[PDB]
Every structure is written in C-alpha cells, then in structure tokens.
C-alpha cells in the first residue's frame, strides 16, 4: 500500500503542479493584456481632457 500511495501522491502532485503552471501562463497573458489596456485607457483619458482646452 505504501509504494502505491507514495507514487500515486508523487504523480498527483506532479499533475497538480503542471496544471498550476498552465493556469499561471494563461493568467500571465491575461495580466499583460489588462495592464497594457489600463495604461492606454489612462493615456486616452488624459489626452481627451487636454484636448478639451
């Protein structure tokens, strides 16, 4: 039973780390997109406020 749970646990934690890394990559892509969009939105707000003068 040991050598069966110490290998099943190893495999389960390997798969958990793989899924976590995949989700991290997806979330990093989303984060970069969102921060670029935030910078652009702030720039557009400042430019539109300055062009109204």
């Amino acid at each position: 039973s040991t050598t069966s749970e110490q290998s099943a646990r190893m495999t389960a934690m390997d798969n958990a780390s793989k899924n976590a890394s995949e989700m991290i990559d997806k979330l990093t892509l989303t984060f970069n997109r969102t921060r670029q969009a935030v910078i652009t939105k702030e720039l557009i707000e400042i430019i539109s406020g300055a062009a109204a003068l």
Partner: protein
C-alpha cells in the same frame, strides 16, 4: 475696496472683471445683491483685468454683470477662545443658531507654513488606551497621525474613540474639522459632545471648536474648510502656547475638492484624474499642521482610501506627511476584529527601541513576525490541510490566531454595535499580555477567550466563564 462684475459662471467657477484694483490671488470677494453671503476666492489672473474665482457657496441665481466687491484680504475667520463650543462654516459664519461669534481678532485662513528653524524634534508617546495602536504603531504627542481606510472599515468610529479617550483626558482646546463628510455624523458628534460635557452651551468652559463643511457643499467650501479648522488650531497653538488636538475627517475630501474644479480652472488632468497640483496643495496645507517651538498640535486625520487602493495618488501622497499611520483593512474587519487596524501595514516613527524601550519594541516585533509567519503558513494550510503541519507550526498558528483576537478591543463608542462595554487598556498591560501570549503562557486557553477583551486578566476570566458554561 475695488468693484468688479461677474462675466462668466460655469459650475462652481466664476470670472470677474475689475476695471480698477485687480485683487491679489487668494482674496475673498463678496457678491452684491444676494440673500446669503456668497464668497468667491480668487485663484487665477486671466489677463485683460479678469480673475477666475472659486465659489464658496452655490452659484445658482448669479447674473452676468452682478457687482462683486473686493475685501482686500483672504477669507478671515474669527479666532479666539470664543470659538470654543461653537460651529462655524468655511467662511467663519456661526452655523449653530447660537448667535454671532464675538471674538476680538480675526485670522486669514491662508498663511505660511512654519519655517525649518521652528521645528521641534521631541517625540513622546501618546498612550491612547487602544491595544493595537499602542503596541504596534503608537502615537506621539505633537505628531501627525493619519488613519487610512476604505469606505466602511471604521475610520469614524476610531476617530470618535480617540476623541473620547484623549480629548476627555486632555486639557488643551481640541478642534474638530469636518471636511466633506456626512452632516448626520456632524450632528451626532455635536450632540455626543454636548452630552459628554466637552461642549457647554452655558457657563462657557467648552474645550472644543467645531468647523464643518459637508458633502452638500460646493467644491470650494470643501477645499477650504480644512484650512479654516487649521487656522483655528493655529491660533490656539501660536497666540496662546496651548497644546492643541486637531481632528480632521475626512482629509481626502480636501484633495478631492480640488479635482472637482481643476479642469474648470483650465488645467490638464494628471494621473488617475487628479489635479496637476495635487502634491503641492497637500504640502502647503499639511505643512501648517505641525508642532513648532511656540506650541504643539497633535493631529488625527481620517484619510479615505478610494476602493481600498492605498496606491491612489491621494493616500500615497498623504503617507509622507504623517508620523504614525494607522491603516484599517477590510480583510480584517470581515474577520470580525475591531478595530480593523492592519498590524503588518501600520507604522510609527517612535517604534524605536531607544524611544519605547527594548521590551515594547521586542514585543511589537515578535507580534508582527508571528503574524507574518501565520500568513506564510496559511498557503501550506490550504494545500496540505491543518493535520499535516509541523507541531512548531501548529503552535505558531495557535499563538497567531490568539494574538489576532487579542489585538481586538471593545470600544466605548461602539457599545451599540457590539453591546459590549468599553475597555481602556493601559500600556504596560498591553505589553505584558502580548508578551505572555508570545511566551506560551496561555496555550491551554481557547482563542475565543481573547476576542474583545481588555487586559489579559479579562481573557482568563472569559475563558473560565466559557468553560463553566460548557
């Protein structure tokens, strides 16, 4: 003095054309032919003998060509001991229906900050009776404090508890400035000060002066009411040498008020939509709230943090103007712990072993370290669960939860929110109780024995009662 005419009215901004005698910037102008007194503060000279001004009251009913008179000075408010127990608005009018404020001297609400050679380096701990404040980020006599928090985390309750404790223990003419806050809270504070004897409607021994400009005021009044309260406190500090308490709630509104006129004054917006002059306006206001060699001003300022950001330009700019910041957290208030002071985000410049003593400093650092270790262990607890922790780590988590509960405290002003009685814990009792929790002297008692208690003896008694019940 000089007379001009209104030539433009856009929102809370009014342009006035003077033929003779253009008034300097920051002068107060009175509009002629109005029921109530309307005051316009000059902000810019536009050229062609026209000045842009900000209105201290509403601009409805204003007509182009209406006469405007120059007073020759900035807004002058009455200062003196006659202002104690009274309520005045941004321009110094009494708004308590108790008659005029017959002082003998008036002070302009715009003045220069004290010089560098007028600064005092004295740092002396001000014990408030609150466990978390005195333990981790203690306040100093004559220092600037600042209470940061989002909407609904407990800034007003904490500032009212501070009022209660210190001001009733104080003998130095407190001053409260409501800056763009709820009028309901202003009436509440007024009446809980009357019923507390701090304000006396007869036999004038009142020890608090109130200055109020609330949310329903135009941007100009909400931008200048902080200066009005500051000027009252400044008179009490300089011309009388007294030690003043200065409560301000909320100071963020001051900043916000500026924004609401910035673009109408013809200014390109800066980041997050704030005036380009944010830092310098905050500077010239806050640098007057200070202890000098002529007197002392302890100032508690409630600072609204929009959306729990703390990186928004207003709180981030305020941070560098304070001596002992107390940051309230929503993640802590949702645990049920009050006050919601964040222990790992509050700071005090007198949290120095050479000032508070090595025992106080060591206890504070041990509390902060065990709380940070609890933070670090909660991830392992989420993954593994609790049963697979080391025993040293189960002990760490137990002591950390106990310390979390023990930092909580029942307030005298929150007796309606909790039903509990108010507790005022002395400093040595706080240090001793937290040292005893950190040492392991109470590993056998439950954690709910430390929730909303005063000294540690109350934790022991509460545990004994909780056991005797079940």
């Amino acid at each position: 003095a000089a007379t001009g005419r209104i030539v433009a009215v856009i929102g809370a901004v009014v342009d006035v054309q003077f033929d003779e005698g253009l008034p300097p910037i920051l002068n107060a102008l009175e509009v002629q032919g109005r029921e109530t007194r309307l005051v316009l503060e000059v902000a810019q000279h536009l050229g062609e003998s026209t000045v842009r001004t900000i209105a201290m009251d509403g601009t409805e009913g204003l007509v182009r060509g209406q006469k405007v008179l120059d007073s020759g000075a900035p807004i002058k408010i009455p200062v003196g001991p006659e202002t104690l127990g009274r309520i005045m608005n941004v321009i110094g009018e009494p708004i308590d229906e108790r008659g005029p404020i017959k002082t003998k001297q008036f002070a302009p609400i715009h003045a220069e900050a004290p010089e560098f050679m007028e600064m005092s380096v004295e740092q002396e701990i001000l014990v408030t009776g609150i466990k978390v404040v005195d333990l981790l980020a203690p306040y100093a006599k004559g220092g600037k404090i600042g209470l940061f928090g989002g909407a609904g985390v407990g800034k007003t309750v904490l500032i009212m508890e501070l009022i209660n404790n210190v001001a009733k223990a104080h003998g130095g003419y407190s001053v409260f400035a409501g800056v763009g806050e709820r009028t309901r809270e202003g009436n509440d504070l007024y009446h809980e000060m009357i019923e507390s004897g701090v304000i006396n409607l007869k036999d004038a021994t009142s020890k608090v002066a109130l200055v109020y400009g609330q949310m329903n005021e135009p941007p100009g009044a909400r931008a200048r009411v902080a200066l009005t309260g500051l000027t009252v406190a400044e008179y009490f500090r300089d011309q009388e040498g007294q030690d003043v308490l200065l409560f301000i709630d909320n100071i963020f509104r001051f900043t916000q008020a500026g924004s609401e006129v910035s673009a109408l004054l013809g200014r390109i917006p800066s980041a997050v939509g704030y005036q380009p002059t944010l830092a310098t306006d905050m500077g010239t206001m806050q640098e007057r709230i200070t202890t000098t060699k002529k007197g002392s001003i302890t100032s508690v300022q409630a600072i609204y943090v929009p959306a729990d950001d703390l990186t928004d330009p207003a709180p981030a700019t305020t941070f560098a103007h304070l001596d002992a910041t107390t940051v309230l957290s929503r993640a802590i208030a949702e645990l049920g712990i009050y006050p919601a002071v964040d222990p790992l985000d509050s700071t005090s410049r007198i949290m120095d072993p050479n000032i508070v003593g090595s025992e106080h400093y060591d206890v504070a650092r041990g509390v902060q370290k065990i709380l940070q270790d609890y933070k670090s262990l909660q991830d392992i607890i989420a993954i593994l669960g609790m049963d697979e922790l080391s025993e040293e780590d189960k002990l760490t988590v137990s002591r950390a939860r106990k310390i979390q509960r023990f930092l909580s405290q029942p307030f005298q002003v929150a007796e309606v929110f909790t039903g509990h009685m108010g507790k005022l814990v002395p400093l040595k009792e706080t240090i001793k109780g937290f040292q005893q929790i950190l040492a392991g002297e109470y590993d056998h008692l439950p954690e709910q024995a430390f929730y909303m208690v005063g000294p540690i003896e109350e934790a022991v008694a509460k545990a004994d009662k909780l056991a005797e019940e079940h």
